Amino acid sequence: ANIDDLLGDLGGTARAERAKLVEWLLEQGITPDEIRATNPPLLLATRHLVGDDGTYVSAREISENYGVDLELLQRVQRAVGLARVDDPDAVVHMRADGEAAARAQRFVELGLNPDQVVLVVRVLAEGLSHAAEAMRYTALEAIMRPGATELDIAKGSQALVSQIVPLLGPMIQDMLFMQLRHMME
Amino acid sequence: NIDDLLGDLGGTARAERAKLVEWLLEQGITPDEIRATNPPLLLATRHLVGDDGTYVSAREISENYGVDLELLQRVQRAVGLARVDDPDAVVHMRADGEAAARAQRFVELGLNPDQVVLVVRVLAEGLSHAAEAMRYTALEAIMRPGATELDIAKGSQALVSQIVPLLGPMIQDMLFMQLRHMME
Numbered sequence A: 001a002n003i004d005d006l007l008g009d010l011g012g013t014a015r016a017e018r019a020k021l022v023e024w025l026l027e028q029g030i031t032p033d034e035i036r037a038t039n040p041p042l043l044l045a046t047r048h049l050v051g052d053d054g055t056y057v058s059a060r061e062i063s064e065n066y067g068v069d070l071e072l073l074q075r076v077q078r079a080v081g082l083a084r085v086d087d088p089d090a091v092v093h094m095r096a097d098g099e100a101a102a103r104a105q106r107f108v109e110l111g112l113n114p115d116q117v118v119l120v121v122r123v124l125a126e127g128l129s130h131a132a133e134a135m136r137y138t139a140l141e142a143i144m145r146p147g148a149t150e151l152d153i154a155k156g157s158q159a160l161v162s163q164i165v166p167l168l169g170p171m172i173q174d175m176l177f178m179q180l181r182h183m184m185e
Numbered sequence B: 001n002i003d004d005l006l007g008d009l010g011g012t013a014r015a016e017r018a019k020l021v022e023w024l025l026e027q028g029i030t031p032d033e034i035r036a037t038n039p040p041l042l043l044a045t046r047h048l049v050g051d052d053g054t055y056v057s058a059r060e061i062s063e064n065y066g067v068d069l070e071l072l073q074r075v076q077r078a079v080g081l082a083r084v085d086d087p088d089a090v091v092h093m094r095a096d097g098e099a100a101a102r103a104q105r106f107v108e109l110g111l112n113p114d115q116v117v118l119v120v121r122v123l124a125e126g127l128s129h130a131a132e133a134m135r136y137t138a139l140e141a142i143m144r145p146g147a148t149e150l151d152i153a154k155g156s157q158a159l160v161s162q163i164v165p166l167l168g169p170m171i172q173d174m175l176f177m178q179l180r181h182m183m184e
C-alpha cells in the first residue's frame, strides 16, 4: 500500500486506524497532496462544508478580484484576526475568508465610518471566536463515543456538520437581529 | 391628539418632538407604543429589524413552532433579554420566539441541551457587544449638527434600510470565517 507514505511515522494500532481513514478520504475526492499537508487529516472530508476548499489567495489578489481597496481590506483582515498577516502578496488567506472581508468595503461605501466598521468587525470576531470554542466542544461531545477509530470520528463528523450547517447560518442571523431589536431601546 | 404624547418636554425640544410624533402616527405607530417608548426616535426603524409590534407568549411559541417549553424558557434566559419567567405572559416579540424555537432543531440532531443552551449564551454575549458598537457606528453616520429629531428618524430609516440586507449575510459569513479556523 504505497499510501504507506501518507502514514508517515505512525505505527502500532494507530497506523491501521490512519490507513482506514486515508482509504475513505481518497475515495471522497480528497487528493494525496491535501492529506500530507494536514495532520490530523481527520477534518478534511468536512472542512468543505464550512467554506474551506483548500484554495488560498493574497490580499492583493482579493483587492483586484472583488474590486476593493487594499488598505481598508487589510485593516478588516487584521480585525478578523485569523491568519498571521501583513503582506499584500502572502498567499495565506482562505478564498472564502477573503471574500468575506471584501464585503466590509460595502458598509464604508454606505457612509459608515471606516474606523467604526473595522471596530465592529473586531468586536464580532471577538464574540464569535468564543462561541466557536463553545461550538467545537458541543459537536465533539456529540461525535466522540466508546472507543471510536479515526474513521468513525471522520464519518460522524461529516454526517453531523452536514445537518448542522444549514441551520447555523439563519440561526446566528436571527440572533444578531434579536440583539438589534433589544439594544434599540 | 399629540399634546399628551409630548410628555414633559418643552420649548425647542417640544416642537421637534411634535413634528416627529406627527410623522410616527402616519407611519402606523400607535400612541401606546410612543408613550411606552421614550425616546420614541427609532419606532420607524424597528420594523426594519423584525419588530412587527405583535407579541406572543411562550405557550403560543411552544405549540405553534412545535418546540418544548422547558428548552424554550432556558434559551430565552440564555439570550438574557426578556426575563418574565412565566409560561403565558404575552411579553415576547413574535420574531424572538421564532428565533428561540430554532434551538429545538439542534437538540433533535443528538446535540446536548445543556451545551446548545451554553452556545446560545456565548453567542448572545458577543452579539450584544457587537450590536452596541453597531448602534454607535450607525448614530455617527445618521447624525450631524443641528439636525432635528425628525431628521435623525428619516435618515436612520434610509440608512438602516440599506444596511440590513448586508448584515445577515455578514454575520453569517463571519461565523463560518471563525468555524473554518477551528478546523485548521
Ligand SMILES: CCCCCCCC/C=C/CCCCCCCC(=O)O
Binding pocket: A076, A100, A101, A103, A104, A107, A112, A117, A118, A120, A121, A180, A183, A184, B042, B134, B135, B136, B137, B138, B139, B156, B160, B163, B167, B170
Ligand atoms: C465585516 C463587517 C462590517 C461591519 C459593518 C458594521 C455594521 C453596521 C451596523 C448596523 C447599523 C444598523 C443598526 C441600527 C441601530 C440604530 C441606531 C439608533 O439607536 O438610533
Ligand SMILES: CCCCCCCC/C=C\CCCCCCCC(=O)O
Binding pocket: A043, A135, A136, A138, A139, A140, A157, A161, A164, A168, A171, B075, B099, B100, B102, B103, B104, B106, B111, B116, B119, B120, B179, B182, B183
Ligand atoms: C438558539 C439555539 C442555538 C443553537 C446553537 C448551535 C449549537 C452549535 C453546535 C455545533 C455547530 C458547530 C459546528 C462546528 C463544530 C466543530 C466540529 C469539528 O470540526 O470537529
